Design a protein around this ligand. Sequence first.
Ligand SMILES: *[C@H]1O[C@H](CO)[C@H](O)[C@H](O[C@H]2O[C@H](CO)[C@H](O)[C@H](O[C@H]3O[C@H](CO)[C@@H](O[C@]4(C(=O)O)C[C@H](O)[C@H](NC(C)=N)[C@H]([C@@H](NC(C)=O)[C@H](C)O)O4)[C@H](O)[C@@H]3O)[C@H]2NC(C)=O)[C@H]1NC(C)=O
Ligand SMILES: *[C@H]1O[C@H](CO)[C@H](O)[C@H](O[C@H]2O[C@H](CO)[C@H](O)[C@H](O[C@H]3O[C@H](CO)[C@@H](O[C@]4(C(=O)O)C[C@H](O)[C@H](NC(C)=N)[C@H]([C@@H](NC(C)=O)[C@H](C)O)O4)[C@H](O)[C@@H]3O)[C@H]2NC(C)=O)[C@H]1NC(C)=O
Ligand SMILES: *[C@H]1O[C@H](CO)[C@H](O)[C@H](O[C@H]2O[C@H](CO)[C@H](O)[C@H](O[C@H]3O[C@H](CO)[C@@H](O[C@]4(C(=O)O)C[C@H](O)[C@H](NC(C)=N)[C@H]([C@@H](NC(C)=O)[C@H](C)O)O4)[C@H](O)[C@@H]3O)[C@H]2NC(C)=O)[C@H]1NC(C)=O
Ligand SMILES: *[C@H]1O[C@H](CO)[C@H](O)[C@H](O[C@H]2O[C@H](CO)[C@H](O)[C@H](O[C@H]3O[C@H](CO)[C@@H](O[C@]4(C(=O)O)C[C@H](O)[C@H](NC(C)=N)[C@H]([C@@H](NC(C)=O)[C@H](C)O)O4)[C@H](O)[C@@H]3O)[C@H]2NC(C)=O)[C@H]1NC(C)=O
Ligand SMILES: [Mg+2]
Ligand SMILES: [Mg+2]
Ligand SMILES: [Mg+2]
Ligand SMILES: [Mg+2]
Lengths: 111, 111, 111, 55
Amino acid sequence: FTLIELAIVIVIIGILVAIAVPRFVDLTDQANQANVDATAAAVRSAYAIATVQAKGIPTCDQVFANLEGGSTSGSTWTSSDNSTTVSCNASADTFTISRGGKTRTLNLTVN
Amino acid sequence: FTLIELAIVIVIIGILVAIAVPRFVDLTDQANQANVDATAAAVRSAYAIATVQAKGIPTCDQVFANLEGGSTSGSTWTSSDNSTTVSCNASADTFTISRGGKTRTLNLTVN
Amino acid sequence: FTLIELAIVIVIIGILVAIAVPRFVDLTDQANQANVDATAAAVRSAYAIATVQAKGIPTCDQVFANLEGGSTSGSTWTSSDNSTTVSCNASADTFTISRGGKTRTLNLTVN
Amino acid sequence: IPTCDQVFANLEGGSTSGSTWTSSDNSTTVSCNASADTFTISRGGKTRTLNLTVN
Ligand SMILES: *[C@H]1O[C@H](CO)[C@H](O)[C@H](O[C@H]2O[C@H](CO)[C@H](O)[C@H](O[C@H]3O[C@H](CO)[C@@H](O[C@]4(C(=O)O)C[C@H](O)[C@H](NC(C)=N)[C@H]([C@@H](NC(C)=O)[C@H](C)O)O4)[C@H](O)[C@@H]3O)[C@H]2NC(C)=O)[C@H]1NC(C)=O
Ligand SMILES: *[C@H]1O[C@H](CO)[C@H](O)[C@H](O[C@H]2O[C@H](CO)[C@H](O)[C@H](O[C@H]3O[C@H](CO)[C@@H](O[C@]4(C(=O)O)C[C@H](O)[C@H](NC(C)=N)[C@H]([C@@H](NC(C)=O)[C@H](C)O)O4)[C@H](O)[C@@H]3O)[C@H]2NC(C)=O)[C@H]1NC(C)=O
Ligand SMILES: *[C@H]1O[C@H](CO)[C@H](O)[C@H](O[C@H]2O[C@H](CO)[C@H](O)[C@H](O[C@H]3O[C@H](CO)[C@@H](O[C@]4(C(=O)O)C[C@H](O)[C@H](NC(C)=N)[C@H]([C@@H](NC(C)=O)[C@H](C)O)O4)[C@H](O)[C@@H]3O)[C@H]2NC(C)=O)[C@H]1NC(C)=O
Ligand SMILES: *[C@H]1O[C@H](CO)[C@H](O)[C@H](O[C@H]2O[C@H](CO)[C@H](O)[C@H](O[C@H]3O[C@H](CO)[C@@H](O[C@]4(C(=O)O)C[C@H](O)[C@H](NC(C)=N)[C@H]([C@@H](NC(C)=O)[C@H](C)O)O4)[C@H](O)[C@@H]3O)[C@H]2NC(C)=O)[C@H]1NC(C)=O
Ligand SMILES: [Mg+2]
Ligand SMILES: [Mg+2]
Ligand SMILES: [Mg+2]
Ligand SMILES: [Mg+2]
């Protein structure tokens, strides 16, 4: 390369640097909260559907039977990507929904 | 970097900019209205259930006992995320449901 | 940005596009039908309650006195969001319930 | 269902003249055919079509 071309390069490098560039940000807290909230809405609907199926107060299993996005092991349901959990305390008439420390609780009577 | 690579970069930057990009929009008015409406539906059902429990006209507390998503302090119920409110005027036979300035009123006889 | 970063961006844009995305659909016909049907159920109950209050065949006004979700101007009742209408033809012993072109008719004797 | 103008109101990088939006550097175009429930996006002969119901 000629000295002129190198001089031009030395100029242009200095100008294509000293742009702004975005930071990466750990937005997983906000996303986890929305996941927990959307899951809580789904649990309420799944419970409501279960009260028709049960013709009365539903069992914990009847509620989780109506959730699509995951699998269940006795008294708990887990999203297929394992981070979101739902669980009953059937004696405490309560569902807890949680993901990455974000959490929500539904006080729905269940057996 | 060579001058050719910088020239190519100067071209491509100018083309990956001058896309469209969406505006963020404060859609909280539309969402607040839907929250107030969904809550109003819940209050009507909670009231209807309360008329069976009460075997007659229900008390303001008997109505709020049938709402899941929050807590009550005398004559008012508040969503667990505190922005949605329901309140009785038991002398005025009225429930008011409100959130972020969006509001609805139910004229249900209560004591 | 380097040419490599722009190349990576050109690849990833092409893959985050060419997802599926849902269509918006005007489901207002199905929702309007359900509104008309739910309102028709309410009119039947309001009429039945009115036959006890009247100790006989009720007046058109005695029937609408038992409906919560709206207001009345002589011989018609309108939802507080004005789109759903109920009206008597007291000479034709008929109530018509309608919303957005969806309609239902109840042949209940009234005066 | 939104109008063609309500859709373009939400795009930042350009301007609109009835039924079309154009990037501020004028080469990228978007246009509605509101009767055909379609948006066409194009630039320098490269093109894409979205079948979204609009009025
Ligand atoms: C929901 O299903 C999913 C998959 O479908 C998953 O498997 C979940 O976990 C379970 O998975 C297995 C069963 O399918 C595990 O074995 C386990 O079962 C649980 O139940 C066992 C029998 O009730 C229990 O065993 C005990 C016992 O039999 O008494 C309880 C104690 O561990 C006990 N130990 C002591 C010291 N008291 C013995 C123990 N003995 C000794 C000396 O250590 C055994 C014989 O070694 O075992 C299991 O311990 C277990 O609770 C279960 N996973 C767990 C919790 O490990 C399934 N349900 C859920 C949500 O757990
Ligand atoms: C519903 O429950 C939730 C939580 O479960 C929440 O706590 C709500 O608010 C209340 O919370 C506390 C009680 O649990 C507060 O103390 C408060 O109580 C209300 O009732 C008090 C007694 O009736 C009342 O006190 C008065 C009084 O005793 O007369 C009323 C006046 O304030 C009065 N002042 C004057 C000048 N007349 C006195 C006052 N005196 C002076 C000289 O200032 C006191 C002695 O300092 O107090 C309280 O004022 C209060 O109304 C209540 N929160 C509020 C409203 O602050 C609970 N209910 C709801 C919805 O409020
Ligand atoms: C139910 O209540 C709600 C609110 O509570 C709502 O107001 C409804 O609509 C009514 O609202 C007003 C009354 O509160 C309106 O004035 C109107 O009243 C109706 O009754 C009037 C008197 O009976 C009637 O006026 C007439 C008349 O007096 O004869 C009838 C004719 O219009 C007549 N015109 C002619 C050419 N014959 C005259 C007219 N004269 C001329 C030369 O034009 C007048 C003097 O200008 O008026 C009204 O016309 C009206 O029917 C009523 N709203 C309407 C229908 O406009 C209330 N009831 C319902 C459901 O309507
Ligand atoms: C979107 O906005 C941007 C800027 O905000 C841009 O301006 C776009 O282009 C338009 O810009 C002007 C209007 O703001 C132009 O005038 C033009 O307007 C269009 O509408 C005119 C009236 O509807 C139209 O005129 C007509 C007519 O009035 O009938 C249609 C024919 O041209 C007609 N000719 C004949 C032979 N039938 C007459 C013509 N008569 C003769 C004898 O020639 C006139 C009187 O000379 O004119 C215009 O022709 C035009 O369509 C519009 N730019 C264009 C298309 O030229 C704006 N909208 C878009 C996207 O176009
Ligand atoms: Mg139980
Ligand atoms: Mg009372
Ligand atoms: Mg009659
Ligand atoms: Mg159309």
